[PDB]
Amino acid sequence: AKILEGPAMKLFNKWGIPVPNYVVILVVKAHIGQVIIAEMAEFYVSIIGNKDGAELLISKHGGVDIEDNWDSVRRIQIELDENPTIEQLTELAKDAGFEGEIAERVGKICSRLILCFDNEDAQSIEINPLVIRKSDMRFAALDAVMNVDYDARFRHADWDFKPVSEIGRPFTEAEQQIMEIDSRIKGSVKFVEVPGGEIALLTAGGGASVFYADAVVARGGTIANYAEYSGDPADWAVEALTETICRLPNIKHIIVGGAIANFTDVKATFSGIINGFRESKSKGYLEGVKIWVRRGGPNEAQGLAAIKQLQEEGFDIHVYDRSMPMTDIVDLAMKS
Amino acid sequence: SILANKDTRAVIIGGVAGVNAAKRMAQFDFLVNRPLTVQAFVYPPEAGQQKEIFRGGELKNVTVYDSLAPALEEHPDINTALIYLGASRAAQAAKEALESPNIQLVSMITEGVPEKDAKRLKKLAQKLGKMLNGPSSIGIMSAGECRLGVIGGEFKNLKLCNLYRQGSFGVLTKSGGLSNEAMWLCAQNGDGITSAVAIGGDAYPGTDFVTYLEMFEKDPATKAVVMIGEVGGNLEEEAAEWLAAEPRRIKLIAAIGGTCQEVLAGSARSKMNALRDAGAYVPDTFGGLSKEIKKVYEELIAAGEISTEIDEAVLPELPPRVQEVMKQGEVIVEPLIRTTISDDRGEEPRYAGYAASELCSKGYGIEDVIGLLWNKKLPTREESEIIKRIVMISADHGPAVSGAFGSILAACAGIDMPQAVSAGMTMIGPRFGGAVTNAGKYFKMAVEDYPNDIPGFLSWMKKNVGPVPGIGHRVKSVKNPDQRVKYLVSYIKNETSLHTPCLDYALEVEKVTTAKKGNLILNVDGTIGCILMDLDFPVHSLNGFFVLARTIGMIGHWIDQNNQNSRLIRLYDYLINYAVKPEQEVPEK
Amino acid sequence: LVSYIKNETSLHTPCLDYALEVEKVTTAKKGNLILNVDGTIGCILMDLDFPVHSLN
Numbered sequence A: 001a002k003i004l005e006g007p008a009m010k011l012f013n014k015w016g017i018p019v020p021n022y023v024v025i026l027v028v029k030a031h032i033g034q035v036i037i038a039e040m041a042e043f044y045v046s047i048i049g050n051k052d053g054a055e056l057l058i059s060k061h062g063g064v065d066i067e068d069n070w071d072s073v074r075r076i077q078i079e080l081d082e083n084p085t086i087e088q089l090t091e092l093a094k095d096a097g098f099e100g101e102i103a104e105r106v107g108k109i110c111s112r113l114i115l116c117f118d119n120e121d122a123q124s125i126e127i128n129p130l131v132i133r134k135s136d137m138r139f140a141a142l143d144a145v146m147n148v149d150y151d152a153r154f155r156h157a158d159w160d161f162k163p164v165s166e167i168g169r170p171f172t173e174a175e176q177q178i179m180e181i182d183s184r185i186k187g188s189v190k191f192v193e194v195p196g197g198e199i200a201l202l203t204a205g206g207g208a209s210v211f212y213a214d215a216v217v218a219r220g221g222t223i224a225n226y227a228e229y230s231g232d233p234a235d236w237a238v239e240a241l242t243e244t245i246c247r248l249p250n251i252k253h254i255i256v257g258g259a260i261a262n263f264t265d266v267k268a269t270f271s272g273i274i275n276g277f278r279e280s281k282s283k284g285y286l287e288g289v290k291i292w293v294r295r296g297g298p299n300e301a302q303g304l305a306a307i308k309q310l311q312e313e314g315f316d317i318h319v320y321d322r323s324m325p326m327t328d329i330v331d332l333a334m335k336s
Numbered sequence B: 001s002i003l004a005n006k007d008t009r010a011v012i013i014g015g016v017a018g019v020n021a022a023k024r025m026a027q028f029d030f031l032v033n034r035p036l037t038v039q040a041f042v043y044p045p046e047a048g049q050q051k052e053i054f055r056g057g058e059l060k061n062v063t064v065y066d067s068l069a070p071a072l073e074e075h076p077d078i079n080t081a082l083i084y085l086g087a088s089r090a091a092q093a094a095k096e097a098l099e100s101p102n103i104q105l106v107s108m109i110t111e112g113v114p115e116k117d118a119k120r121l122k123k124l125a126q127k128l129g130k131m132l133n134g135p136s137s138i139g140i141m142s143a144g145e146c147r148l149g150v151i152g153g154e155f156k157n158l159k160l161c162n163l164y165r166q167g168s169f170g171v172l173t174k175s176g177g178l179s180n181e182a183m184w185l186c187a188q189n190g191d192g193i194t195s196a197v198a199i200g201g202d203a204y205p206g207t208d209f210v211t212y213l214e215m216f217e218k219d220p221a222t223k224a225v226v227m228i229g230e231v232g233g234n235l236e237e238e239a240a241e242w243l244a245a246e247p248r249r250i251k252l253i254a255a256i257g258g259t260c261q262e263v264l265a266g267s268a269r270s271k272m273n274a275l276r277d278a279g280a281y282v283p284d285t286f287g288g289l290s291k292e293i294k295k296v297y298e299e300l301i302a303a304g305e306i307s308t309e310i311d312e313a314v315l316p317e318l319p320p321r322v323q324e325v326m327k328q329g330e331v332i333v334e335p336l337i338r339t340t341i342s343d344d345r346g347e348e349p350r351y352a353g354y355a356a357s358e359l360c361s362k363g364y365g366i367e368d369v370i371g372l373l374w375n376k377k378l379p380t381r382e383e384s385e386i387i388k389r390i391v392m393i394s395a396d397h398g399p400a401v402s403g404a405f406g407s408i409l410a411a412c413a414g415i416d417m418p419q420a421v422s423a424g425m426t427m428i429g430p431r432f433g434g435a436v437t438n439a440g441k442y443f444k445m446a447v448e449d450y451p452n453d454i455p456g457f458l459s460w461m462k463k464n465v466g467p468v469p470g471i472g473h474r475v476k477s478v479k480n481p482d483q484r485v486k487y488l489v490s491y492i493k494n495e496t497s498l499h500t501p502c503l504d505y506a507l508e509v510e511k512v513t514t515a516k517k518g519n520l521i522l523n524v525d526g527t528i529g530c531i532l533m534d535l536d537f538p539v540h541s542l543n544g545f546f547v548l549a550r551t552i553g554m555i556g557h558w559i560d561q562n563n564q565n566s567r568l569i570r571l572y573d574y575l576i577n578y579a580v581k582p583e584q585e586v587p588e589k
Numbered sequence C: 001l002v003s004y005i006k007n008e009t010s011l012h013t014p015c016l017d018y019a020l021e022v023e024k025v026t027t028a029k030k031g032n033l034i035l036n037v038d039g040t041i042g043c044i045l046m047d048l049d050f051p052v053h054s055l056n
């Protein structure tokens, strides 16, 4: 979970990491609804987590010139809960090219970074540049790129921040509405709008959703959205998700797919889908659109029978069972 | 099979999610005809309780322990732990399980387990030489042998995927929902699975793909492995490295999610290319996976590694619930009770066939609901007006009377209202308020057997029942009349069309009894008893009017003592006559 | 009862109004977490300002 410049700096501050004085409401960058203003040799420091702990990469060639100067980078592997001493870090600095007084200083900074990483549940922290003002020996972390493990938030009461958006652009109304629904529920509901796209996905489980999207792209098609629902979510949340998908512009087919559920009740979830299809059809949204259903899971007979009844209500709905290979409804949809 | 087998005995550490896992595991244990896998539950909130788990039609009681130490002490048999706790507690429970010398395998379903915690647990499992599956793992399924978790879904799915016997295919997925799809694909296009393992979708799983592939390579039953991965990490790259490194006996079939390289190092094209180059069967889409399984299965038949031995098994079916069998009329259930007065099964109760809210809307009252529930007939305006007055006039008669005093005593002893009122209601009987029914019976019998013979009736009563029910009062007398009875009598005689032979008779015996003792007045019990007998109300219902009415008073007194903040009553010494035995020494035994 | 209090009286029932809002949240968690007769009578009577002790 990528976090903003301000928050990152706050944690740096907390673990005593040289940071320029900043204010969130001289330089002027944006976090548009928020702007940051901070006072303005260069080095590179980054700590990137791995299966065995983390790796600390250090370079004397900081700033933009680090791309070609990747041989200058000295890296050490910090084994989980076996954090190096200041001297080791000083030696690490020394290997890079740091001499006497600064090496220790760099080493000391590194430890703090290491403490910050260990204690803040970070995935990675990247400082480029870590600048030095030789006149008085003052250091400052100019560009702070921090990723924290947001699932860990319950251990951190000082985390008065939210993580940055996965896709570069922040979320729309429908999107934020679906994220609100998910936070409140024990199950999971995810919705991402893809600009344009003729084929709308309403698929169960993250793994199956990804295979259905791949199938569409591979078959030449265009995805209208990315939608996942898993962990036996509440019908209303599923109905909320169905409704959102139907509201989508210029959609030709609906892919109501999924694998064979292990615990998600297909009758409950299909009732939420049915209710949302009925709600959307009365509002005039599902005119001409063909619905493609392929599903398995607890109470699949009852839910599949309930969804095939939607044929007598005038819906162009094709419903298949497990015998139909999972992503092969995408072919049947492409052919139409 | 690879991790779970007929020797696996589990402890489920978790609550309701754990119990649902155990119920699913019990369905598998019934199908493959093995003893229950779950031996115990560890859940401090429910410590000491027992969970009812059905193994087919047989109920099994599984004990809930406060901690793992007493669970393993009572069940040394346990070698597996399943963690069904939330993120904040899962890692500590997993640590406790890994540190237990009995536990060899720990599997976690938990989602949102901090990466730092999963990394620490992987390190601990390695030090101790134990297996850690998950976090975010739906479970481990060994066809015909063991099910750990909800993996495999409904009972019908276990049968469709032939999970009651070993096949030739191993299943490795990150995704839970996709292990069930893979199991089906192996049953549909191959001969079924050996073991299916969901490794979890977390950044740092406890055990990766290669760890499991090594185990499958050593399992003689597994001839091929269906591995379902996705973009992120290098778990599939390392598996391609494992396959290329040495000549492997097992064939690897792999599908990688994330080829959305047209929409916005660990790439699904880079993973598909590494595996394809390593010699794995990699389809272009998930749909091609069924074709890759059919390819490998046909090679195995041709190469004589699989035998075409037909499914020679008469499988057990899940017993229906009693209600299902009843609906079909295939079982006889003799009811425990029969009710004739109300039906609660609809949107609202129906009292004697009438909807409770429909009675409110159409302007009926409490007195009309009394008649419906006690006579099964809507009262007439006349009847309704008498019921209303009987209830109002009997509602309370001060705090000195047994019923009211019982409620006051309980109210002061700090007892809650329903329980305090029940103590006062216990006092209603032959001497206080509960002579309504008998007054009705004996006065009706007097009218029939002694019409012009009150001394005969009285002689018969003295000899056979004792005091006449409905006659006598402790404070009311001829010199101190009970205006409650004068009011009711004048209402019935002057404001209604009712002919009252019982009441007429009772009023005549009052003239005779009060001539003997002035306090032998016709009381409220006798008055209500006769009025209701003359209205032809069921005899059983007669005491209901006092019991219901005096409940208004009894709740009143309870509220009053509570509003006063009354202290406990301990009866004053000077009011007790201790007519006790002389004090004496106890003799030695 | 709710329909009678809302449509046949001009009473202001803040407890009942609150209880009806929590019912929308609780029934979203589990469908059987409805506002029952106890809660309904409790709220109506609190809004009529009947003594707390008398409610049961």
Ligand SMILES: CC(C)(COP(=O)(O)OP(=O)(O)OC[C@H]1O[C@@H](n2cnc3c(N)ncnc32)[C@H](O)[C@@H]1OP(=O)(O)O)[C@@H](O)C(=O)NCCC(=O)NCCS
Binding pocket: A186, A231, A263, B014, B015, B016, B017, B020, B021, B043, B044, B045, B084, B085, B086, B087, B089, B109, B110, B111, B150
């Ligand atoms: C399965 C899952 C829902 C179970 O987690 P859960 O509801 O958090 O489980 P817990 O038993 O820890 O939590 C229930 C409550 O008991 C409490 N509790 C648990 N152990 C306790 C203990 N030892 N002492 C006191 N309280 C305890 C918790 O604090 C919690 O209360 P809260 O919600 O007010 O904080 C969850 O771990 C998860 O999200 N899993 C992923 C979804 C999945 O795969 N589900 C499988 C369905 S079979």
